[PDB]
Design a protein around this ligand. Structure first.
Ligand code: FCO
Ligand code: F3S
Ligand code: F3S
Ligand code: F3S
Ligand code: F3S
Ligand code: F3S
Ligand code: F3S
Ligand SMILES: [Mg+2]
Ligand code: 3NI
Lengths: 63, 322, 513, 322
C-alpha cells in the first residue's frame, strides 16, 4: 500500500501543467475599494451607454 | 432465404471476416442453412450481364430478395452522383436504393456500411455515408425512416470489420425462425452482441479495476490495461470482442492492442487526428478525457484513486507470461 | 467486337473490363477500376501512425500486408529499432495472411471458373465441377473453410484478423506467450496437413519444393496417384487440357519488392538496407534480366487514371487528386487505378507484373544470400513455357509450401523471453518507405511525416501495378496486356477475361484505395 | 517422445477433456507431433498381457518413457496397500512409483493426480493423494523431492478436469523444442496458464469491479458477478479459463456458474461442507470471508463501497441479453 501511495504521489509529482509564481498584492485596505465601487455604480449606466463613444475615441488612438 | 451481398466503398474486410466464420462456417451457412447467396462480388460466379441480370431481377422484384447485405460505404461523390462507385452500369448508391427498397431485410455489415466508417473520415473524398447512419447521426443514405419489407430498419452489424459471428449468427437466427429473438439497440445493432462492451471479457479488466496501466507495447502488454496509456476504447465500446473471440483466438485488447472503438459509429474516433492514435487523451496529464460509459470523471477518478491505493501486488506484475 | 464486362467480380472490388475482340481473340483491353475511397487523401494531416489503422482498411484480404508495410514505413521514417522477435512476428503474420489468401483466393475466387461451360468438352470437366463448383465443390469447401486457419495464427499474435493494427514502429503490440506459439504451430501444422499437403499437394511440402524445373513439376504430377489427383496435380492437368497455359502471358516483366526480413538484418529498418535484409527477395525481372529493386524508380502515372496530374510522380511526391469520372472519360481516363511504372535502364518507365510469379522470378535471381529465397523453379518455368494463367497460378500456389516452411521455422525462431517492441521516438519529421509482398505482390507505402502529422501518404498496391491503366506512353498495364491475346469462346460469358484478371488475384479495393 | 498415460483414482474427465483438444486436436497431437502414445486406458489398443508388457518395459527401462501422464489419484487404501486401485496385476501406486521413476517427465493431469482432488475429500475412503501434493501440502505420493529424469518435479496440470490446452500445449511445447519455455509456479503448474486468474477474461469482471452481484441463477446471470452470492472463486483461482475458453466456447463464469477454484490444490474448497456450495461465505452477512487474491478485507471492502457508489447504470442491468 505504501508502494501504491508512492507511485500515486510520484505521478502527482510529474504534474506537467501550467504554474505561475506571483507574490505581491499589497495596498488594498488603503484603496477605497468600496468608494471606487460607489463611483463605478453611479458611473456604470453612463459607461455602458458611452461604449460607442469610447470605442470611437479608442479607434482614433489605434492609428 | 435469398441473400444479395453488395460492396460499395468497402475493403471487403467484412466479407473476409465473414469467410472466417465458424459454427457455422461460411460454406455451411450458404448451403446448409437455406440461405441462397444470389451473388457476392467476392464469391458470386456470375460476371457481367449474367450478374447484372441477377441484380436487376432483385431490384425490380422479378425474384425475391430476402436479405440485402451491404458492405462498404454508400459512395455519393462526385456531387452526389455516386460515380466514384460505379457498379454493374450504375452508381452503387442507385443499386443500394433499389435493393434496399426490394429486400425483406437490409443488413449493413461493417462500419462503412453502418455509419460511413473510415472512408467517411474527413475530408471524405468519396462522399461516403452509411446506409442509415452517417457516424452517430441517424439517417445516412436511406434516411432515418427507411424500413425494409419486414419492417426492420437497416440491421447494423458494425465493426471494421464485423466479426463473422456478428453476421452469421444473425443469419442463422433468421434461417432458424429466431428473427423475433433479434433485438436492435439505438444504432440498430444486434443487442445479443452489442449490449456488452469490448471490455466485457477483456483479460485486462482486473488491471483496469486496479488502474494498473500497460506502459508499453510488446512485452509491456504482459501486464496492465491499455485504457490509460494507449487509448483503449474498450469501456466505451459496445461489442462482444472479448466475449466472442476473434478468429476463435483472441481480441485486440487481449493481444495488447487498444480497442479502437470500431463498433461505435464515430469510428475512427477523433478521425485519427494527431496525438489520438494509440494514446489516451488526458486532461492535466492524469484525467482521461473520456471515462468509461455511464461513469463521470469525478466518481471515476475517485474510484480510480481508491483502486490504485488498494491495488494488489499481482495487478502490478506481468500476468500474460510466457 | 467491343465487349464491356461489368462487373468482373471475384477481384475483391469493383472492376470493369473493356476488350476489343477480333476473330475470338482479345486484341486490346482496358481495365477500369470503378470504386474510389481516397485513403491517401484521408491520411493527410492525420496522426503519423494513422496509417496503421487506415491502410489495413484498404483491403480485407491483404490488410495485414498493408499493416506490415505501413509499420515498416514508420520504422524507416522514425529510424526505429526492430527486436528480432517483432520481425519474426511480422513475418509470421504477413506470411499467414498470404497462406490464408492462397486457398481462399484459389477456390473462392479463381477455381470456380474452371467449372465454366466452355470446358464441358474436357475429359476433366466433371471432376473440375465436382471439386471446384462454388460452395459445393469437394475441393472448394475444405479449401475455403481451412483458409481461415493461417489467419487464426495471425489473430493469435495480432488479436484478430482482418483489422488488427498490432504492427507498430519499434515492433509489435503483442507479447506472445508459450501457448500462443504452440497453438500457432499446431494451427499451422493442421492447416498444412489438412489442406496444403492432403488436398492441395497430395504430398509433403518438402516433396513439392523438390520441384526445380517445369519438367520436375510434370513428373511430380505423374509420379503417383496422390499427386496426380491432388488439387495441384488436377489443376495443372486441367490447365494443360483446357489451355490455361496458352494465354494470360502478360508483360513478362516482373516487380517484387520482397518481404520477410531476416530479423538480424533489419533490426534498424532503413530504406537502403531493406533489400539485403529480405528473405523473400526483391527483384525486377525485365527484358529477361535481373535488376535490383529500388523504390526511387517507382513512378505513378495518372494519364488514363481519374486523377489530376501531368507527369509520373515518385510516390514521395505523389498526389491523389480525383477528377470526376465524366470529365476524365472525356479526357480518355478510364480507371481509378493509378498506373505504377518502374524505371528500368534501357527500357524506360515500364509496367511490371507483381505477384507470386514476380516473387518466384526474383527468387530465381543469382547471388542469393543464405537467408534469402533461392529458387530456380520459375526461372525454368518462365524459360520453358513462359507466363500464363496457369504459370501465374502455379507461382501463387508454389508459395504455399514455401511460406508454410518459413512460418514454421519463424515460429521456432521466436525467443519468447526476448523483446517484441522497442519504444521508438515519434519524430515530428520523417520519410518512410515500407514495402512487403502482399499475397498479390509488391505493396508499398511512401510516407512523409511533417510537423508530427502525415504530410504525404502514397500507397502503391500490387494490383495497382498489375491492373493500372495505360501510362502516358499508352503502354498497357500488365493485366491489360495479359488480357490481350486471350481467346473469347463466349462473349456472353467471357470467362477467359476472368481467368486472366483473377490469375493475378486482382484486388480492386487495393488497386484504388 | 513416448507417452504412457495411466489412470489411478480418475474419472477419466481429464482424458475426455484432452480428447476435446483443438489446435492441436488429440489425433494430430498423437500422430503428427512425434508423441508416441504407448498406452492409455481409454485409448490403448493393447489389453491384458500385451498391455502389461508395455507397462513393464516402461517401468524396468527396457523401452524409454519420455512422458508419464498420470490422471486420477494415487490410491493408497486400504492400509497403504493401494488395493482399492489394482491395475494390471499391481496396486496402481506401485505402477506410479516405477513409471514416475522411469519417466523423463511426469505430468499429473487433473486435481486428483496433482493434489488428490475430489477423492481426497474427507473421509478419503480410497486413501487418495496426488503425485507430489496432497492438497496444498507438497509431497503427495512421490515426496516433495521427487524429480523426473529431466530434473523436473511432477508437472501439475490441475483442473477438474484440466482444459485440453493445459496439457496439449505443454505437450506441443515439449515436442517443438520449447520445454525450456515452460516455467512452473510453486504448485508446479505451467505459469503460461496459471499466472492469470479464472477472473482474467471473465465476462463479469466489470460487474465485479462495480460490486454488482448476480442475484440468481438462470436469467439472473444475464448480469452481475458471481463472487458475492454464488461463491465464485474466480479472483482467488489461478487458471486461464476465461483466457482460453472451455470447448472453445465458454467458461463456467461466463455461463453463470461460479468458479469452484478447481485449479487450486484445495479443490473442492471447504470439502463442499454444508452452506459452501454455490454460496459466498460472509462475515456479518456482507463481508466475504475470502477476498480476491492479494487483497485484504479492509482495502477490499473500502474499494467495494466506493465502487458500489460509483457503479454506472449499465453495471446494474442485464448485459448478456438474448
Ligand atoms: N495482396 C494484396 Fe492487396 C493487392 N493488390 C495489397 O497490397
Ligand atoms: S473492414 Fe472494410 S468494408 Fe469498411 S467496415 Fe472496415 S473499412
Ligand atoms: S480492460 Fe481491456 S478493453 Fe481496454 S480499457 Fe482495459 S485493455
Ligand atoms: S476496435 Fe473493434 S473489433 Fe472489437 S476490440 Fe474494439 S470493438
Ligand atoms: S476430471 Fe476426474 S480424474 Fe480427477 S481431476 Fe477431476 S475427478
Ligand atoms: S468477475 Fe467472473 S471469475 Fe467470478 S468473481 Fe466475478 S464471476
Ligand atoms: S472451477 Fe476450474 S475449470 Fe476454471 S472456471 Fe474455475 S478454475
Ligand atoms: Mg496509391
Ligand atoms: Ni487486397
Amino acid at each position: 500500500i505504501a508502494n501504491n501511495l508512492t507511485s500515486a504521489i510520484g505521478e502527482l509529482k510529474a504534474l506537467n501543467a501550467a504554474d505561475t509564481p506571483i507574490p505581491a498584492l499589497a495596498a488594498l485596505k488603503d484603496v477605497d475599494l468600496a468608494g471606487l465601487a460607489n463611483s463605478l455604480a453611479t458611473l456604470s449606466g453612463g459607461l455602458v451607454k458611452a461604449t460607442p463613444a469610447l470605442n470611437a475615441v479608442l479607434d482614433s488612438l489605434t492609428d | 432465404a435469398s441473400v444479395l451481398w453488395f460492396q460499395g466503398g468497402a475493403c471487403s474486410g467484412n466479407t473476409m471476416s465473414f469467410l472466417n466464420a465458424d459454427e457455422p462456417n461460411v460454406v455451411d451457412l450458404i448451403v446448409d442453412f437455406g440461405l441462397d447467396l444470389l451473388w457476392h462480388p467476392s464469391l458470386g460466379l456470375e460476371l457481367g450481364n449474367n450478374a447484372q441480370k441477377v441484380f436487376w431481377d432483385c431490384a425490380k422484384g422479378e425474384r425475391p430478395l430476402d436479405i440485402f447485405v451491404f458492405e462498404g460505404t454508400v459512395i455519393e461523390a462526385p456531387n452526389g452522383t455516386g460515380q466514384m462507385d460505379m457498379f454493374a452500369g450504375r452508381p452503387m448508391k442507385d443499386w443500394v436504393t433499389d435493393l434496399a427498397g426490394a429486400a425483406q431485410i437490409v443488413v449493413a455489415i461493417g462500419d462503412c456500411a453502418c455509419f460511413g466508417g473510415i472512408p467517411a473520415m474527413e475530408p471524405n473524398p468519396s462522399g461516403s455515408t452509411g446506409l442509415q447512419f452517417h457516424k452517430r447521426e441517424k439517417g445516412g443514405f436511406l434516411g432515418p425512416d427507411f424500413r425494409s419489407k419486414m419492417g426492420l430498419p437497416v440491421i447494423n452489424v458494425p465493426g471494421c470489420p464485423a466479426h463473422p459471428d456478428w453476421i452469421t449468427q444473425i443469419l442463422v437466427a433468421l434461417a432458424t425462425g429466431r428473427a423475433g429473438d433479434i433485438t436492435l439497440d439505438d444504432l440498430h445493432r444486434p443487442e445479443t452482441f452489442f449490449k456488452t462492451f469490448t471490455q466485457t471479457g477483456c483479460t485486462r479488466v482486473q488491471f483496469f479495476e486496479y488502474k494498473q496501466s500497460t506502459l508499453s507495447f510488446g512485452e509491456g502488454t504482459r501486464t496492465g490495461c491499455l485504457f490509460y496509456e494507449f487509448g483503449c476504447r474498450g469501456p466505451m465500446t459496445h461489442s462482444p470482442c472479448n466475449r466472442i473471440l476473434w478468429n476463435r483466438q483472441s481480441s485486440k485488447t487481449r493481444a495488447g492492442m487498444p480497442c479502437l472503438g470500431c463498433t461505435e459509429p464515430e469510428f475512427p474516433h477523433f478521425d485519427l487526428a494527431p496525438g489520438t492514435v494509440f494514446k489516451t487523451q488526458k486532461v492535466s496529464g492524469m484525467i482521461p478525457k473520456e471515462v468509461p460509459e455511464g461513469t463521470d470523471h469525478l466518481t471515476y477518478m475517485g474510484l480510480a484513486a481508491a483502486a490504485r491505493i488498494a491495488a494488489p501486488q499481482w495487478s502490478k506484475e506481468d500476468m500474460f507470461v510466457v | 467486337l467491343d465487349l464491356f464486362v461489368s462487373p468482373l467480380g471475384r477481384v475483391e472490388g469493383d472492376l470493369d473490363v473493356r476488350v476489343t475482340i477480333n476473330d475470338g481473340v482479345v486484341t486490346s483491353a482496358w481495365t477500369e477500376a470503378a470504386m474510389f475511397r481516397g485513403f491517401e487523401i484521408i491520411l493527410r494531416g492525420k496522426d503519423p501512425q494513422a496509417g496503421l489503422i487506415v491502410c489495413p482498411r484498404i483491403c480485407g484480404i491483404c490488410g495485414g500486408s498493408h499493416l506490415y508495410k505501413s509499420a515498416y514505413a514508420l520504422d524507416t521514417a522514425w529510424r526505429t529499432h526492430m527486436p528480432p522477435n517483432a520481425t519474426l512476428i511480422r513475418n509470421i503474420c504477413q506470411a499467414c495472411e498470404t497462406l490464408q489468401s492462397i486457398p481462399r483466393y484459389f477456390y473462392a475466387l479463381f477455381a470456380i471458373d474452371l467449372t465454366n461451360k466452355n470446358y464441358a468438352k474436357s475429359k476433366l470437366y466433371d471432376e473440375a465441377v465436382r471439386r471446384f463448383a462454388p460452395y459445393v465443390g469437394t475441393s472448394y469447401q475444405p479449401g475455403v473453410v481451412l483458409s481461415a486457419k493461417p489467419v487464426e495464427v495471425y489473430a493469435i499474435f495480432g488479436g484478430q484478423w482482418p483489422x488488427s493494427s498490432f504492427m507498430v514502429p519499434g515492433g509489435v503490440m503483442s507479447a506472445p506467450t508459450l501457448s500462443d506459439v504452440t497453438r500457432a504451430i499446431a494451427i499451422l501444422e493442421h492447416w498444412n496437413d489438412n489442406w496444403l499437403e492432403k488436398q492441395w499437394l497430395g504430398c509433403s511440402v518438402d516433396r513439392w519444393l523438390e520441384n526445380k524445373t517445369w519438367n520436375d513439376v510434370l513428373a511430380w504430377v505423374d509420379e503417383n496417384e496422390s499427386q496426380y489427383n491432388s488439387d495441384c496435380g488436377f489443376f495443372i492437368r486441367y490447365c494443360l487440357d483446357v489451355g490455361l497455359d496458352k494465354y494470360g502471358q502478360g508483360v513478362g516483366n516482373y516487380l517484387a519488392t520482397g518481404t520477410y526480413f531476416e530479423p538480424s538484418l533489419y533490426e534498424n529498418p532503413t530504406i537502403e538496407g531493406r533489400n539485403a535484409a529480405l528473405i523473400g527477395r526483391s527483384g525486377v525481372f525485365a527484358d529477361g534480366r535481373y535488376f535490383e529493386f529500388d523504390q526511387a524508380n517507382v513512378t505513378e502515372d495518372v494519364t488514363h487514371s481519374f486523377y489530376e496530374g501531368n507527369r509520373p510522380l515518385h510516390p514521395f511526391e505523389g498526389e491523389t487528386i480525383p477528377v470526376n469520372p465524366e470529365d476524365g472519360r472525356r479526357q480518355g481516363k478510364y480507371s481509378w487505378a493509378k498506373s505504377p511504372r518502374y524505371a528500368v535502364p534501357g527500357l524506360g518507365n515500364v509496367p511490371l507484373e507483381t505477384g507470386p510469379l514476380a516473387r518466384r522470378m526474383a527468387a530465381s535471381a543469382p547471388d542469393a544470400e543464405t537467408h534469402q529465397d533461392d529458387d530456380p523453379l520459375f526461372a525454368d518455368i518462365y524459360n520453358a513455357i513462359g507466363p500464363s494463367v496457369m504459370v501465374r497460378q502455379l507461382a501463387r500456389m508454389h508459395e504455399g509450401p514455401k511460406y508454410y516452411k518459413w512460418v514454421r521455422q519463424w515460429l521456432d525462431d521466436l525467443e519468447l523471453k526476448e523483446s517484441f517492441y522497442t519504444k521508438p521516438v515519434e519524430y515530428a519529421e520523417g520519410k518512410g518507405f515500407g514495402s512487403t509482398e502482399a499475397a498479390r505482390g509488391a505493396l508499398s507505402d511512401w510516407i512523409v511525416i511533417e510537423d508530427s502529422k502525415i504530410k504525404n501518404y502514397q500507397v502503391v498496391t500490387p494490383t495497382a501495378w498489375n491492373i493500372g491503366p495505360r501510362d502516358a506512353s499508352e503502354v498497357l498495364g500488365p493485366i491489360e496486356q495479359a488480357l490481350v491475346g486471350s481467346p473469347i469462346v463466349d462473349a456472353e460469358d467471357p470467362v477467359e477475361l476472368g481467368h486472366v484478371a483473377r490469375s493475378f488475384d486482382s484486388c480492386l479495393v487495393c488497386t484504388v484505395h
